[PDB]
Specification:
The protein has two domains: 127 residues, Thrombin, subunit H (Beta Barrel), CATH 2.40.10; 111 residues, Thrombin, subunit H, CATH 2.40.10. The protein contains two helices and 14 strands, in the order ββββββββββαββββα. A hairpin with a 2-residue loop joins strand 3 and strand 4. The strands form two sheets. It has an eight-stranded antiparallel sheet with strand order 1-9-8-12-13-14-11-10. It has a six-stranded antiparallel beta barrel with strand order 2-3-4-7-6-5. The structure holds the ligand NCc1ccc(Cl)cc1CNC(=O)N[C@@H](Cc1ccccc1)c1nc(-c2ccc3c(N)n[nH]c3c2)c(Cl)[nH]1. Ligand 3Y3 binds next to strand 3, strand 13 and strand 14. The PDB classes it as hydrolase/hydrolase inhibitor. Keywords: serine protease, blood coagulation factor, protein inhibitor complex, HYDROLASE-HYDROLASE INHIBITOR complex. The assembly is monomeric. The entry is titled "FACTOR XIA IN COMPLEX WITH THE INHIBITOR 1-{(1S)-1-[4-(3-amino-1H-indazol-6-yl)-5-chloro-1H-imidazol-2-yl]-2-phenylethyl}-3-[2-(aminomethyl)-5-chlorobenzyl]urea".
Amino acid sequence: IVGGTASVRGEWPWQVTLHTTSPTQRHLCGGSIIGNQWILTAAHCFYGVESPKILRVYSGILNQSEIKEDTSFFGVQEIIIHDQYKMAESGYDIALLKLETTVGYGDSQRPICLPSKGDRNVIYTDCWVTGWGYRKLRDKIQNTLQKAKIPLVTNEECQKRYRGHKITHKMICAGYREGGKDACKGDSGGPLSCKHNEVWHLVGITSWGEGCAQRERPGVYTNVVEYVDWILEKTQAV
Ligand SMILES: NCc1ccc(Cl)cc1CNC(=O)N[C@@H](Cc1ccccc1)c1nc(-c2ccc3c(N)n[nH]c3c2)c(Cl)[nH]1
């Protein structure tokens, strides 16, 4: 996160750190708890990932330093990538992780509500992007979970900012015209959480952008409301 601040413990209890153990254990992507066996993240995170056996999900983490060999985690039973997904810039940048065991809910880990079908017409004015990603273009993964409030941008306005790309309604953008606050390297897969009627909703999935927090370059997010049926299809399968 560029231009953000340290989060308070328990502030984003749906935020997870997805680690890889191949070749060395390290943070790979952000993610969100949406169910007691389900993590919602970005499909691009799994480029070259041949097995879910190399993945570890850590919930209830403020600081990456809390993760040691003895730290409990959730194994991944299955990686579910949207089957229309080709690349982040083309959309369908969404994936589900089916966990091997059940997340016990508490004040350190709980699910975030998915947007409602009716909420496609609602205007969110209180949106936050969270993660352990870089604070600048050339940096390292941050110890403490960072947060930054970002305004949503219309599709039309986002499309003017990305000449040469096709910004679909399955994408949602967020950023300041002058830049300064955004997601950066290591934040992808994480949430864009918006508070409306005292309830947090998973409005976006950190997907892609041209650089980090650049002037007239909004962050591009998977528009979660456009995938609620896909999420229900994969999580509510008979
Ligand atoms: N252009 C930035 C931008 C701006 C606004 C918005 Cl909304 C989205 C984005 C996108 N921001 C991303 O996170 N992009 C992902 C893409 C990607 C995901 C997974 C694997 C490969 C590529 C990314 N993650 C890392 C990364 C991961 C882990 C570590 C680590 N342990 N050390 N260093 C790291 C660095 C890099 Cl580099 N790039």
